[PDB]
Ligand binder design. Structure first.
Ligand SMILES: CCOC(=O)Cc1nn[nH]n1
Ligand SMILES: [Cl-]
Ligand code: NA
Ligand code: NI
Ligand SMILES: [Zn+2]
Length: 329
């Protein structure tokens, strides 16, 4: 079997290989990439997402979220406090201010150490989950607004014809902005392009070991676990690499830089943080291999994890038994 140690693999497709998106995902999996839960794809040198980023400052962040931590440095939750709307230009200025700017650091490992030491003592502001795209409509390869839809995938695989749309999200980040441990909705794939700015560090647990992370999370967040049997769905719990290592949890880490794609694979738990001001775009997608993961995906029914209108049909068709109870939440 390929990639038995579940290492994060990095791919360098040629411009010809970059034409057929589905085919390249299948290729990566043939090499065992999915075993890690996460892969990096560096686009060919001939490719670009758009011409420039000089004109993005007027995009609105309608509901920036302040990420307020509780707990200890290595085991904490974050709750999201709504702030007043800002433009991207205003947000960038805020990110670069003394209060929020990345501290001096020697390299990525030094900054990673500073993040886990000091994250809880600050409350950075994240402009997450903004419907939109920054790919030029003329970019034909790996344009995250022009992928095949999950609804069409389900139809092709299962004959299933369903309502729903699937469009990309933009994210504007700053130092210490954090994505909590999660898998995607319905354990879908995701793809993330870092358009501009400072890096993003990722942590990931191999899909074959996801239940080990879940068990540790239940132990570390016992009240949350009693409240919901899928509380990681809430996307608020953080566990540091030190604590994961202490508890024998298999994981890997990698830093994504501007101009690079990351793909997360079905049931690949991931978490991480932004190094400084940046802009990313992401969307969920499916392949034939996803279908069995979708059938088995845990669900939050406590009501906290509120989700997109597209998810109804996925639960309805793939998980009819669970549908009524899920719909209640
Ligand atoms: C407000 C919390 O926002 C997030 O966690 C957004 C995010 N999800 N994955 N990377 N960023
Ligand atoms: Cl710091
Ligand atoms: Na490893
Ligand atoms: Ni994700
Ligand atoms: Zn829940």
């Amino acid at each position: 079997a390929q990639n038995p140690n579940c290492n994060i693999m990095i791919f360098h497709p040629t411009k010809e290989e970059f034409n057929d998106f589905d085919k390249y995902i299948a290729y990566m999996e043939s090499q065992g990439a999915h075993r890690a839960g996460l892969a990096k794809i560096i686009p060919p040198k001939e490719w670009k997402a758009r011409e420039t980023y000089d004109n993005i400052s007027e995009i609105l962040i309608a509901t920036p979220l302040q990420q307020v931590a509780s707990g200890r440095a290595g085991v904490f939750t974050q709750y999201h406090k709504k702030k007043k709307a800002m433009t991207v230009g205003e947000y960038r200025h805020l990110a670069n201010s003394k209060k929020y700017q990345t501290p001096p650091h020697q390299n990525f490992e030094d900054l990673e150490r500073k993040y886990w030491k000091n994250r809880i003592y600050n409350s950075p502001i994240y402009g997450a989950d903004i419907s939109g795209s920054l790919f030029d409509e003329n970019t034909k390869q790996w344009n995250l607004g022009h992928l095949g839809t999950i609804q069409d995938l389900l139809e092709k695989e299962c004959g299933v014809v369903i309502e729903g749309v699937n469009t990309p999200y933009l994210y504007f980040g700053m130092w210490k902005t954090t994505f909590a441990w999660h898998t995607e909705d319905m354990d879908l794939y995701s793809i993330n392009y870092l358009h501009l700015g400072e890096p993003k560090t990722w942590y990931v647990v191999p899909p074959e070991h996801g239940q080990r992370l879940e068990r540790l999370a239940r132990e570390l967040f016992p009240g949350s676990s009693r409240g919901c049997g899928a509380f990681l769905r809430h996307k608020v719990a953080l566990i540091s690499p030190t604590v994961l290592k202490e508890n024998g949890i298999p994981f890997n880490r990698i830093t994504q830089e501007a101009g690079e794609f990351m793909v997360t694979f079905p049931y690949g738990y991931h978490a991480g943080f932004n190094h400084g001001f940046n802009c990313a775009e992401a969307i969920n997608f499916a392949t034939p291999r996803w279908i069995d993961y979708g059938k088995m995906a845990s669900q939050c029914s406590c009501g906290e994890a509120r989700v997109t209108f597209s998810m109804d049909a996925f639960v309805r068709i793939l998980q009819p038994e669970r549908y009524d109870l899920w719909k209640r939440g």
